[PDB]
Ligand binder design. Structure first.
Ligand SMILES: CC(C)(C)CC(=O)N[C@@H](C(=O)NO)c1ccc(-c2cc(F)c(F)c(F)c2)cc1
Ligand SMILES: [Mg+2]
Ligand SMILES: [Mg+2]
Ligand SMILES: [Mg+2]
Ligand SMILES: [Mg+2]
Ligand SMILES: [Mg+2]
Ligand SMILES: [Zn+2]
Length: 889
């Protein structure tokens, strides 16, 4: 297997200046003609000319219009086209080819493929070489002139990058369109779409230059009524880049296109952003609430790439986080401003500290800029994206908004139209840091370790107060555990946003303060601190670290009730839960190991329960935040704290803690469930797709969270409420009614009812499948077999496969059945999927990422299945490389 090393970067011996493509789509094949106007670079040393080209059928190849002959002048091995250097010109030349490719049977959804009746491309990272020969790397920038031809009845809409400059008829019921895109771009940003697409459109006028931009959003005809919210989101995105960053769109048109079959969420091809339909299409009748934030996030994300990724692009793939971490950070600033709810930032943190912290303590751990890769398709990770976003966000924390904006504009102005590296961004931030510090000797050299060092730092505290001196100190330590990437870890530049709360009145005792920890440890002292404070640490989750606050539960309760920062309140709650979970987990574990006939469990802190009640009953308090405090931390967060985790014992532990709290609070829960109904389910704007109320959706999240708690608890006559909830027009409610009915004999009645409501909308049916998959059912394996036989069948649609299986893998008690039957089932699905879509097969490996954190019997069971998958003779490169890394082989 070929390993690419970051330190080996070298510019090409060649230049491609112009690409002229003709893509002729036929019933049984697509013919691609390409002329590359090329040159010899200053780095050339007389080497063979080697093109990437994967799976291409050669009809002919030529140099300067002279046909080349196989064997004597070139070799092709289905991966690389090698033209021997004696036949390579020494000055500007034309290379041309004609190849045949087959989108109809391209089920891996990379290169050119057919999704239902739409022909569509996906070229990031190295998929352009599946369409035609190229030197397929992002530093090979070129001009593109693209003609697409197709049957006019099947494919009346033709799109590619740039301006449409010709449209023409062709004999035999065909037509063509020509698109000329003169600005340089890397080939991963090429796209083409052909199909019977329907659209909504609008005109946007830019803020400063007053340019008219045409906005088009496209889907298949059946779903064209689900396009409105995306178009609104795109308008909002454009305005936010204008307003926060002073950046306008530069092109006359931007197209968004939904397709049914997509490996990920969406892709930022220049002027032609292509989406998984689940991340573009919604309507209030046919979508759950989460779709609205998802579409806002993903439309924004792709729009913000037009600067961070498209106008400023990557020198090489090791710089991926430079465009992805920075664009996720832009999208989170945008979504925080649009939603105006504290749960937006909390949801990001909740995902990071579960999914990304698990990755970073697994055998897969990597820094946000890895040193090597084998599969690019395996490189697009939550580390690169979400820890990258937190690294890009720490610059804003460190600089403050004014100097952050100054530094960001330096980045953009200096690198616009060019490739760039992570150092170029750090350089820009450093210029702003010198300005903020009024010190031309200040530097951010240490900050570069965030790009190279893997692992999650642990930050811990000790406190001291001298009442006579009115002097308070915070002593802080950082540690990252050694791992396979660095034997010796270095201290990082860690910004610690802090407040000091006066415990008598809840007020702030100091102004906004960001401690800059740059050493393994430091002591920060504060004078004129009139009373011993409770420290409010890492406000807004100011660094991506494990926080050990060394506070008592009394102190954490005070912060939970009275602190100003949503994250520290949420975290203090989290930390109270964790202390309880670890304690009860140990008590259950000992009882199990020692085969005890009786034993004691430590009860939940009663003052903590009283604090939850106080917050729930506060009508001025936020409904989204409330839904977080009545929820235990995610299992994937908890597992980072326990070695040899016995998932049964954790399930018993969570059950005990929820029952303890419900035995005190269920009447409060029920009262709130009923009082929230009027606002939460208000239908005033149900037929207005432009009108989206994130607070209202958070009220529904709270009701649905409470209903789940009350259902599990078998609260008296709660089934009455469940049955009424099933009649709500909102899919979030009526799908909730299905999952909470799992505890009642009405489950299959609601299963049928909600299936009939879901089956005629492709995306809604996928949401129904997820609901079934995640249902807390003792018969879940028989249910999954019924989904397979009756609904999923042999679909190759990644959304269908992910919907049926991934939610079930989060079923702690059943997925981890001690027989290993759940591991066996998901391994079978992975191997089956790997035959046609290696990228999605590796996504389906997700539950195995924590294998070496489980109890020794479950470790053995998971390892056995991974070794079985590794022994499949036909295993893909992707899946083999991933499982070899995951199993430390
Ligand atoms: C929307 C988001 C950022 C939550 C997840 C997502 O859809 N990521 C995109 C992205 O960054 N869009 O700007 C993504 C796009 C392409 C790919 C990608 C990489 C491959 F190597 C590949 F083969 C492929 F098919 C897709 C992976 C992620
Ligand atoms: Mg082929
Ligand atoms: Mg404006
Ligand atoms: Mg996101
Ligand atoms: Mg002191
Ligand atoms: Mg389908
Ligand atoms: Zn992206």
């Amino acid at each position: 297997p070929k390993i690419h090393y970051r330190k080996d970067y070298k510019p090409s011996g060649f230049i491609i200046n112009q690409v002229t493509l003709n893509i002729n789509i036929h019933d049984q094949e697509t013919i691609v003609r390409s002329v590359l106007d090329m040159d010899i670079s200053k780095h050339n040393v007389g080497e063979d000319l080697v093109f990437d080209g994967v799976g291409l059928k050669i009809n002919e190849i030529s140099i300067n219009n002279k046909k080349l002959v196989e064997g004597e002048e070139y070799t092709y091995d289905n991966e690389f086209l090698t033209i021997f250097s004696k036949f390579v010109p020494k000055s500007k030349f034309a290379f041309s080819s004609e190849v045949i490719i087959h989108p109809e049977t391209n089920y891996a959804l990379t290169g050119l493929y057919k999704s239902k009746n739409i022909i569509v491309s996906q070229c990031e990272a190295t998929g352009f070489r599946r369409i035609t020969f190229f030197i397929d790397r992002p530093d090979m920038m070129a001009k593109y002139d693209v003609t697409v031809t197709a049957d006019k009845e099947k494919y009346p809409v033709l799109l590619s990058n740039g301006d449409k400059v010709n449209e023409f008829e062709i004999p035999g019921g065909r037509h063509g369109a020509r698109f000329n895109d003169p600005p340089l771009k890397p080939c991963y940003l090429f796209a083409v779409v052909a199909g019977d697409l329907k659209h909504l459109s609008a005109t946007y006028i830019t803020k400063y230059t007053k340019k008219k931009v045409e906005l088009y959003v496209f889907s298949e005809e059946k779903y064209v009524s689900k396009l409105q919210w995306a178009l609104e989101c795109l308008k909002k995105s454009m305005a936010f880049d204008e307003d926060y960053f002073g950046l306008e769109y530069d092109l006359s048109r931007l197209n968004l296109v939904a397709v049914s079959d997509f490996n990920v969420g969406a892709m930022e091809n220049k002027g032609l952003n292509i989406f998984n339909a689940n991340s573009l299409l919604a309507s209030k009748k046919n979508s759950i609430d989460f779709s609205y934030a998802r579409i806002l996030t993903v439309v924004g994300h792709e729009y913000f790439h037009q600067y961070t990724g498209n106008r400023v692009t990557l020198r090489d793939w090791f710089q991926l986080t430079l465009k992805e971490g920075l664009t996720v950070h832009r999208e989170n600033l945008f979504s925080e401003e649009m939603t105006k709810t504290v749960t937006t930032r909390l949801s990001h943190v909740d995902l990071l500290r579960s999914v990304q912290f698990l990755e970073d303590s697994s055998p897969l751990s990597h820094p946000i800029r890895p040193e090597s890769y084998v599969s690019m398709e395996n490189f697009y990770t939550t580390t690169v994206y979400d820890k990258g976003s937190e690294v890009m966000r720490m610059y804003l924390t460190i600089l403050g908004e004014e100097y952050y904006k100054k530094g960001f504009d330096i980045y953009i102005k200096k690198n616009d139209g060019n490739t760039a590296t992570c150092e170029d961004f750090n350089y820009a931030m450093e210029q702003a840091y010198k300005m903020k510090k009024a010190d031309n000797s200040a530097n951010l050299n240490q900050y570069l370790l965030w790009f190279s060092q893997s692992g999650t730092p642990h930050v811990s505290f000790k406190y001291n107060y001298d009442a006579e001196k009115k002097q308070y100190s915070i002593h802080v330590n950082q540690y990252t555990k050694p791992d396979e990437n660095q034997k010796e870890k270095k201290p990082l530049f860690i910004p610690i946003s802090v407040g000091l709360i006066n415990p008598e009145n809840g007020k702030e005792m100091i102004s906004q303060t960001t401690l800059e920890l740059t050493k393994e440890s430091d002591t920060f002292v504060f004078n004129n601190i009139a009373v011993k404070p409770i420290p409010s640490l890492f406000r807004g989750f100011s660094a991506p670290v494990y926080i050990e606050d060394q506070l008592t539960d009394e102190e954490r309760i005070l912060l939970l009730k009275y602190d100003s920062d949503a994250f520290v309140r949420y975290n203090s709650c989290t930390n109270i839960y964790m202390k309880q979970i670890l304690m009860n987990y140990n008590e259950f574990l000992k009882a199990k190991n020692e085969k005890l006939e009786s034993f004691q469990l430590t009860p939940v802190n009663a003052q903590f329960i009283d604090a939850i009640k106080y917050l729930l009953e506060d009508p001025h308090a936020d409904a989204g935040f409330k839904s977080y405090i009545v929820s235990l931390p995610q299992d994937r967060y908890i597992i980072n704290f326990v070695s040899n985790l016995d998932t049964d014992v954790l399930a018993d532990t969570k059950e005990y803690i929820y029952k303890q709290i419900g035995d005190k609070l269920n009447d409060v829960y029920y009262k709130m469930f009923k009082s929230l109904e009027a606002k939460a389910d208000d239908l005033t704007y149900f037929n207005d797709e432009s009108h989206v109320d994130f607070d209202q959706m958070n009220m529904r999240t709270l009701r649905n969270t409470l209903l789940s708690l009350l259902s599990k608890a078998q609260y008296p006559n709660i089934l009455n409420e469940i049955i009424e909830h099933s009649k709500s027009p909102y899919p979030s409610n009526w799908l909730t009614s299905l999952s909470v009915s799992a505890y009642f004999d009405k489950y299959f009645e609601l299963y049928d009812k909600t299936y009939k409501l879901s089956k005629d909308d492709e995306l809604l049916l996928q949401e129904w499948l997820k609901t079934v998959s995640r249902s807390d059912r003792k018969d879940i394996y028989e249910i999954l077999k019924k989904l397979e036989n009756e609904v999923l069948k042999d679909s190759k649609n990644p959304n269908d496969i992910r919907a049926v299986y991934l939610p079930f893998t989060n079923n702690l008690r059943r997925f981890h059945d001690i027989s290993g039957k759940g591991y066996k089932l998901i391994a079978e699905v992975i191997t089956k999927t790997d035959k046609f879509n290696p990228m999605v097969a590796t996504q389906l490996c997700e539950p195995f990422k924590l294998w070496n954190k489980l109890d020794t019997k479950r470790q053995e069971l998971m390892l056995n299945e991974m070794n079985t998958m590794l022994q499949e003779p036909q295993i893909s490169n992707n899946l083999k490389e991933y499982l070899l890394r995951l199993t430390n082989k």
